Amino acid sequence: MSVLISGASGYIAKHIVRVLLEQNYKVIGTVRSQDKADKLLKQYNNPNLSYEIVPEIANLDAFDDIFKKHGKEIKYVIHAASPVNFGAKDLEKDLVIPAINGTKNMFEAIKKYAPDTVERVVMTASWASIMTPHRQNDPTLTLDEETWNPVTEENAYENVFTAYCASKTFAEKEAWKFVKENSDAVKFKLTTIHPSFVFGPQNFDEDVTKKLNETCEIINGLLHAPFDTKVEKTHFSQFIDVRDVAKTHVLGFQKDELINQRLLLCNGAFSQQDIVNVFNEDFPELKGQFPPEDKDTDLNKGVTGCKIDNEKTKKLLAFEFTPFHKTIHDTVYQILHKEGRV
Ligand SMILES: NC(=O)c1ccc[n+]([C@@H]2O[C@H](COP(=O)([O-])OP(=O)(O)OC[C@H]3O[C@@H](n4cnc5c(N)ncnc54)[C@H](OP(=O)(O)O)[C@@H]3O)[C@@H](O)[C@H]2O)c1
């Protein structure tokens, strides 16, 4: 009944591991180095947690050694390892190949060493494999769980963000293709999770560093920006709270209703300024130490970009998502409190 989770040192994954340990699962995480594993073991201080070292998911048969050692005990797999790096300079090598090869490697390791043992795979995809990046602000587009990013390999590399979104799209397509072609040989059922921009506190306060993971660095950077910084007030994207994401991944292997589902995790539109507005409203004593409030945002004019039809997802998951104001508040509070400022 052990649970394998790839890329276990990341922002989302550390919350998933917390949830797994709350529920008394035996957890095997993969991280890139023994230093990372050692630090994490001390953070959780939980005998049910172990780490195996997978230094590069893109490399040949990267997950075979794990299934050689642990094949018999791994009943569930959470495939969360994929690069989220909008500073990548080599878009093929740093984003697209690791996303795809990581996914192929995990599924082929399962097929070779535990085709009848692994019951469920929950894969972290993204809403990036559902939405169209240049239409995030297009109210004529309605997304649902059957919508696909139409990006092709030919136009994937327009910029770093389209390339990231393509890595997620192409990886997920390979996931469903594998499932299609191996229906009778491998018993696992797949569930894919599709978060939008993930905000919320780091799982451990000590992990609040000068620069955070890419998506929370949006908030962290605005929070530390000079008062005179120009902040955009036009619609940016959809968000979801990291704690909702983590909860969904664990439900993903537990609930039969989630078999063969793509789950679209969005809970609200925002601009940069809507984030800043939370700083000023909730920490008024620090006004002037970050950019100012301005209520003239796209959101407040009823402008939210592409439409999100995730009713099926919400009905399947049943639990209520965390609202934007709380997600931002909790992110900001953790940072300011760590800094000894509130
Ligand atoms: N944050 C979001 O808004 C968002 C939204 C939708 C989906 N997701 C997906 O959720 C997953 C984690 O995202 P995150 O925001 O938590 O980012 P993160 O904090 O940067 O987590 C990434 C984790 O994957 C590992 N990783 C990436 N590339 C790897 C590689 N080539 N080889 C081995 N390990 C690798 C990282 O290990 P190292 O740090 O040591 O490289 C890290 O453990 C990803 O699949 C992401 O695509 C994120």
* Any ligand 1 atom below 6 A from CB of 192: no
Q: What resolution, expressed in A, was reported for this entry? A: 1.8
- Among 168, 187, 230, 287, the one annotated catalytic: 168
| Closest residue by CA, ligand 1 atom 33 | 56
Distance 263 CA to ligand 1 centre (A): 18
Domain boundaries, given as residue ranges, for the chain = 1-342
Q: Is 211 a catalytic residue?
A: no
Angle between helices 272-282 and 324-338 (to 10 degrees): 60
User: CB–CB of 12/245 below 8 Å?
Assistant: yes
Say if residue 198 carries a ligand binding annotation.
yes
Pocket of ligand 1 contains residue 76 by CB under 6 Å: no
Q: Using what technique was this structure determined? A: X-ray
